[PDB]
Enzyme design. Structure first.
Site, PDB file in Angstrom:
ATOM      1  N   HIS A  61       0.811  -1.195   0.000  1.00 57.07           N
ATOM      2  CA  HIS A  61       0.000   0.000   0.000  1.00 57.07           C
ATOM      3  C   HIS A  61       0.861   1.269   0.000  1.00 57.07           C
ATOM      4  O   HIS A  61       0.420   2.274  -0.501  1.00 57.07           O
ATOM      5  CB  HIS A  61      -1.123  -0.027   1.177  1.00 57.07           C
ATOM      6  CG  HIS A  61      -0.703  -0.483   2.586  1.00 57.07           C
ATOM      7  ND1 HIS A  61      -0.387   0.237   3.784  1.00 57.07           N
ATOM      8  CD2 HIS A  61      -0.658  -1.771   2.942  1.00 57.07           C
ATOM      9  CE1 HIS A  61      -0.110  -0.727   4.719  1.00 57.07           C
ATOM     10  NE2 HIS A  61      -0.247  -1.869   4.231  1.00 57.07           N
ATOM     11  N   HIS A  91       6.282   6.722   6.333  1.00 63.69           N
ATOM     12  CA  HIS A  91       5.816   6.402   4.998  1.00 63.69           C
ATOM     13  C   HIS A  91       5.131   7.639   4.444  1.00 63.69           C
ATOM     14  O   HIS A  91       4.937   8.630   5.151  1.00 63.69           O
ATOM     15  CB  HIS A  91       4.855   5.189   5.016  1.00 63.69           C
ATOM     16  CG  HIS A  91       3.630   5.471   5.831  1.00 63.69           C
ATOM     17  ND1 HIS A  91       3.563   5.254   7.182  1.00 63.69           N
ATOM     18  CD2 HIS A  91       2.451   6.074   5.493  1.00 63.69           C
ATOM     19  CE1 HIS A  91       2.378   5.688   7.619  1.00 63.69           C
ATOM     20  NE2 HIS A  91       1.686   6.200   6.616  1.00 63.69           N
ATOM     21  N   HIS A  93       1.893   9.092   1.547  1.00 60.98           N
ATOM     22  CA  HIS A  93       0.724   8.924   0.683  1.00 60.98           C
ATOM     23  C   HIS A  93       0.889   9.939  -0.449  1.00 60.98           C
ATOM     24  O   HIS A  93       1.329  11.072  -0.195  1.00 60.98           O
ATOM     25  CB  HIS A  93      -0.580   9.202   1.437  1.00 60.98           C
ATOM     26  CG  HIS A  93      -0.712   8.373   2.667  1.00 60.98           C
ATOM     27  ND1 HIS A  93      -1.362   7.168   2.704  1.00 60.98           N
ATOM     28  CD2 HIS A  93      -0.193   8.525   3.929  1.00 60.98           C
ATOM     29  CE1 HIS A  93      -1.252   6.659   3.927  1.00 60.98           C
ATOM     30  NE2 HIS A  93      -0.551   7.439   4.694  1.00 60.98           N
ATOM     31  N   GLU A 103      -3.632  13.257   2.561  1.00 63.28           N
ATOM     32  CA  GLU A 103      -4.773  12.714   3.318  1.00 63.28           C
ATOM     33  C   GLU A 103      -5.479  13.854   4.055  1.00 63.28           C
ATOM     34  O   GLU A 103      -6.652  14.150   3.818  1.00 63.28           O
ATOM     35  CB  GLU A 103      -4.276  11.598   4.241  1.00 63.28           C
ATOM     36  CG  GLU A 103      -3.784  10.419   3.447  1.00 63.28           C
ATOM     37  CD  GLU A 103      -3.826   9.118   4.187  1.00 63.28           C
ATOM     38  OE1 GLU A 103      -3.341   9.080   5.344  1.00 63.28           O
ATOM     39  OE2 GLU A 103      -4.340   8.129   3.599  1.00 63.28           O
ATOM     40  N   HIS A 116       4.058  10.655   6.915  1.00 65.38           N
ATOM     41  CA  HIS A 116       3.629  10.263   8.239  1.00 65.38           C
ATOM     42  C   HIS A 116       4.807   9.615   8.974  1.00 65.38           C
ATOM     43  O   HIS A 116       5.279   8.550   8.571  1.00 65.38           O
ATOM     44  CB  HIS A 116       2.482   9.244   8.175  1.00 65.38           C
ATOM     45  CG  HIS A 116       1.224   9.853   7.694  1.00 65.38           C
ATOM     46  ND1 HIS A 116       0.146   9.120   7.191  1.00 65.38           N
ATOM     47  CD2 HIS A 116       0.891  11.185   7.644  1.00 65.38           C
ATOM     48  CE1 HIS A 116      -0.791  10.005   6.864  1.00 65.38           C
ATOM     49  NE2 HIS A 116      -0.392  11.254   7.126  1.00 65.38           N
ATOM     50  N   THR A 195      -5.019   5.863   9.311  1.00 68.51           N
ATOM     51  CA  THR A 195      -5.722   6.131   8.050  1.00 68.51           C
ATOM     52  C   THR A 195      -5.764   4.938   7.124  1.00 68.51           C
ATOM     53  O   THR A 195      -6.327   5.038   6.012  1.00 68.51           O
ATOM     54  CB  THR A 195      -5.139   7.339   7.298  1.00 68.51           C
ATOM     55  OG1 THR A 195      -3.874   6.972   6.780  1.00 68.51           O
ATOM     56  CG2 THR A 195      -5.065   8.587   8.153  1.00 68.51           C
TER      57      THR A 195
HETATM   58 ZN   LIG Z   1      -0.059   7.191   6.638  1.00 63.05          ZN
END
Ligand SMILES: [Zn+2]
Length: 257
Positions: A61, A91, A93, A103, A116, A195
């Site tokens: 992911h 990590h 997004h 996010e 994050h 999340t």
């Molecule tokens: Zn995250």
């Protein structure tokens, strides 16, 4: 079998993870006008001098840069936090296009990506127990916009070819996460959740106002990663973000005037 595709994405997660519709879900939109300055908040203390990165993993992911979290080496303290939180991984997004990817949003603005840095409360002894507590995690969120390159990001970018597909990892020692921080530690904070599934409501979110700049070329390399495993149809790892969730009975507090 949750993901970010056309048929297993965020709007489906509640079937396997009913807290997806809970009272303290993340991310949220940060309405800057309605967030209130809280003079009782303290500066954050980000102490990464002794951080020990170990490995980078494509988990299907995102990619996680993992740390030694078997002592208090890289810790987040202060701000809204009571006690000491250990860095375990960071990590990102990101989007398929620069106009999306974050996010959290700021007055509905989406950034190109969001970092994050995930930390767990040492009162609880490790990560798996911490996620079962309402104050188990502290996640430092940092927005990325596309402009100048971030020099401190390049070593991450350059290893991504070696972890293209789900389940691949590579050694990743001696990486200094201080090189991912903006100049200011001004922040917004609120109580929320992971999340990604299992979406546990265990996080004190600390979202920095100042984005970092990364180059087009750096984010382009994020977008070459794959959600799939080796030897499977290629599915680019893009748009691995959950959209904003209802704020419900929460207040977002600002550290700054
Ligand atoms: Zn995250």
């Amino acid at each position: 079998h949750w993901g970010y595709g056309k048929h297993n994405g965020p709007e489906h997660w509640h079937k396997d993870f009913p807290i997806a519709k809970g009272e303290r879900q993340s991310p949220v939109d940060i309405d800057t006008h309605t967030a209130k300055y809280d003079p009782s908040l303290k500066p954050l203390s980000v102490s990464y001098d002794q951080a020990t990165s170990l490995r980078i993993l494509n988990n299907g992911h995102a990619f996680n840069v993992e740390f030694d979290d078997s002592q208090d080496k890289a810790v987040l303290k202060g701000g809204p936090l009571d006690g000491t939180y250990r860095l375990i991984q960071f990590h990102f997004h990101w989007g398929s296009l620069d106009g999306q990817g974050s996010e959290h949003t700021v007055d509905k603005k989406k950034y190109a990506a969001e970092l994050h840095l995930v930390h767990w409360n040492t009162k609880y002894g490790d990560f798996g127990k911490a996620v079962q507590q309402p104050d188990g995690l502290a996640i430092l969120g940092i927005f990325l916009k596309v402009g100048s390159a971030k020099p401190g990001l390049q070593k991450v970018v350059d290893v991504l070819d070696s972890i293209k597909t789900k389940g691949k990892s590579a050694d990743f020692t001696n990486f200094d996460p201080r090189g991912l921080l903006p100049e200011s530690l001004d922040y917004w904070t609120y109580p929320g959740s992971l999340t990604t599934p299992p979406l546990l409501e265990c996080v004190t979110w600390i979202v920095l106002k100042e984005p970092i700049s990364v180059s087009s070329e750096q984010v382009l390399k994020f977008r070459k990663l794959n959600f799939n495993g080796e030897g499977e149809p290629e599915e680019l790892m893009v748009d691995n973000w959950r959209p904003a969730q209802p704020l419900k009975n929460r207040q977002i507090k600002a550290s700054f005037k």
